[PDB]
Amino acid sequence: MEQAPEDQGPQREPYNEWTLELLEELKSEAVRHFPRIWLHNLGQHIYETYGDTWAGVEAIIRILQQLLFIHFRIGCRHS
Amino acid sequence: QAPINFTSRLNRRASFPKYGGVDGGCFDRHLIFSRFRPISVFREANEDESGFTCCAFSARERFLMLGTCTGQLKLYNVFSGQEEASYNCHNSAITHLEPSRDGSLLLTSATWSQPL
Amino acid sequence: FGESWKKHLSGEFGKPYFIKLMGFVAEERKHYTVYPPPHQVFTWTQMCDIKDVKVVILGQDPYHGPNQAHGLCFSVQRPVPPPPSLENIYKELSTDIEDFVHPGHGDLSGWAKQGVLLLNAVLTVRAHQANSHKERGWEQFTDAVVSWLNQNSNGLVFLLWGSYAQKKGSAIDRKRHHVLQTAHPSPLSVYRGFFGCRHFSKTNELLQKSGKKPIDWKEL
């Protein structure tokens, strides 16, 4: 008898805008910890393979948040 | 001292107190935490590959509050194995996640989001 | 197809790669699904004329999902939710057009009657696949179109944003035309430059260096 609570949290209805409110922010911290060499090259590598189709737009927010988590987990203070 | 065998402790606890001898419960914990078996694996079949970061159980042990790379925690029934209620928690990710014992509160900490 | 476009585009056929194009892509239509049909390739050569072309904007890759694109570059069907880079060029349009109205959709049937050559470089790609094909002939068929307009038509402009558009049409003269390039309209384009540049005046403004048929951005 556990009642999972009602999801009245912060919703994200403009998903085409909330991404744009945060995809800059995903770029606004990776440049503060990493050189822009990998940032443009991985962004080009997905754009040659996912393009302007939202399947690289969320997917870069996948890969950037997957690295910025583990790069703040392995034990580098910035990188 | 309680005997090293388990059946020799089992015959001895029938005519002796709780565990069988001096340091009897220690041997009962050697045989019982030296073996494990995977029951269920909980994937994240939305974008075909899982992105979990942090794990914990609930305060009633029915759900287990996993935590994605994207910053949302997703409930899962331990019996069913079904997504039940996602929650748009954080922007960055989920680093730490613990509940309270009364089941009223929940602490989650993020990776780089402006509220941490 | 528009006949007056091929007033002098009869020098597009007799090359060793043209029959490589219209047969094998038709063979790809006889096995697979290349996404845009033949009745959407010919929209740019139908809706606008060749007598009023004033802006040249290239397009790299079509939209591999079903029921999305309709031939023009950076363009998509109207019931499709609008694409993000086309949603990203809207951001500078507010900061430069004071009377900023909103399109609300993704069909670019409003700017096509202005004088913009919304051309995709490779017009057709497969369904659910981005860049599967080789150079089957879509490139040099357009390379013989872009640099041909350096001869006959006049009043163009090159906002060749992104390195894919830089290779194709860079060396066209700056006495007759004006070439201004910056970063990509996508937000996946880490090296900045697009993020606030006011290039979108210079469709209305660089034609004051020419004096030709005018433009309004707000036809949406």
From Swiss-Prot, chain B:
Tissue note: Ubiquitously expressed.
Induction behaviour: Up-regulated in a number of cancer cell lines (at protein level).
Domain of life: Eukaryota
Assembly: Component of the DCX (DDB1-CUL4-X-box) E3 ubiquitin-protein ligase complex, named CUL4A-RBX1-DDB1-DCAF1/VPRBP complex. Interacts with DDB1; the interaction is direct. Also forms a ternary complex with DDA1 and DDB1. Interacts with NF2 (via FERM domain). Component of the EDVP complex, a E3 ligase complex containing DYRK2, EDD/UBR5, DDB1 and DCAF1. Interacts with DYRK2; the interaction is direct. Interacts with RAG1; the interaction is direct. Interacts with LLGL1 and LLGL2. Interacts with histone H3.
Organism annotation: Homo sapiens
Protein's cellular compartments: Cytoplasm; Nucleus; Cytoplasm, Cytoskeleton, Microtubule organizing center, Centrosome
Protein's UniProt name: DDB1- and CUL4-associated factor 1
Residues of the full protein shown: 1045 to 1160 of 1507
Biological role: Acts both as a substrate recognition component of E3 ubiquitin-protein ligase complexes and as an atypical serine/threonine-protein kinase, playing key roles in various processes such as cell cycle, telomerase regulation and histone modification. Probable substrate-specific adapter of a DCX (DDB1-CUL4-X-box) E3 ubiquitin-protein ligase complex, named CUL4A-RBX1-DDB1-DCAF1/VPRBP complex, which mediates ubiquitination and proteasome-dependent degradation of proteins such as NF2. (Microbial infection) In case of infection by HIV-1 virus, it is recruited by HIV-1 Vpr in order to hijack the CUL4A-RBX1-DDB1-DCAF1/VPRBP function leading to arrest the cell cycle in G2 phase, and also to protect the viral protein from proteasomal degradation by another E3 ubiquitin ligase. The HIV-1 Vpr protein hijacks the CUL4A-RBX1-DDB1-DCAF1/VPRBP complex to promote ubiquitination and degradation of proteins such as TERT and ZIP/ZGPAT.
Family to which this protein belongs: Belongs to the VPRBP/DCAF1 family.
This protein's encoding gene: DCAF1
Positions of WD repeats: 47-86, 89-116
Domain notes: The protein kinase-like region mediates the threonine-protein kinase activity. The DWD boxes are required for interaction with DDB1.
Curated annotation (Swiss-Prot), chain C:
Keyword list, A-Z: Acetylation, Disease variant, DNA damage, DNA repair, Host-virus interaction, Hydrolase, Mitochondrion, Nucleus, Phosphoprotein
Active site residues of this protein: 61
Any GO MF annotation of the entry: ribosomal small subunit binding
Effect upon mutating residue 188 to A: Markedly decreases uracil-DNA glycosylase activity. Decreases the affinity for dUMP-carrying ssDNA and dsDNA. Loss of uracil-DNA glycosylase activity
Enzyme class: hydrolase
Chain residues that bind dsDNA: 64, 85, 163, 184, 186, 189, 192
N6-acetyllysine: residues bearing it: 202
Catalyzed chemical reaction(s): Hydrolyzes single-stranded DNA or mismatched double-stranded DNA and polynucleotides, releasing free uracil; a 2'-deoxyuridine in single-stranded DNA + H2O = a 2'-deoxyribose 5'-monophosphate in single-stranded DNA + uracil; a 2'-deoxyuridine in double-stranded DNA + H2O = a 2'-deoxyribose 5'-monophosphate in double-stranded DNA + uracil
Binding site for uracil: 60, 74, 120, 184
EC numbers for this chain: 3.2.2.27
GO biological process, one term: single strand break repair
Keyword Mitochondrion on entry: yes
Function comment: Uracil-DNA glycosylase that hydrolyzes the N-glycosidic bond between uracil and deoxyribose in single- and double-stranded DNA (ssDNA and dsDNA) to release a free uracil residue and form an abasic (apurinic/apyrimidinic; AP) site. Excises uracil residues arising as a result of misincorporation of dUMP residues by DNA polymerase during replication or due to spontaneous or enzymatic deamination of cytosine. Mediates error-free base excision repair (BER) of uracil at replication forks.
Disease: Immunodeficiency with hyper-IgM 5: A rare immunodeficiency syndrome characterized by normal or elevated serum IgM levels with absence of IgG, IgA, and IgE. It results in a profound susceptibility to bacterial infections.
Family under the similarity heading: Belongs to the uracil-DNA glycosylase (UDG) superfamily. UNG family.
Name of the protein: Uracil-DNA glycosylase
Record organism: Homo sapiens (Human)
Primary gene name: UNG
Shown residues within the full chain: 94 to 313 of 313
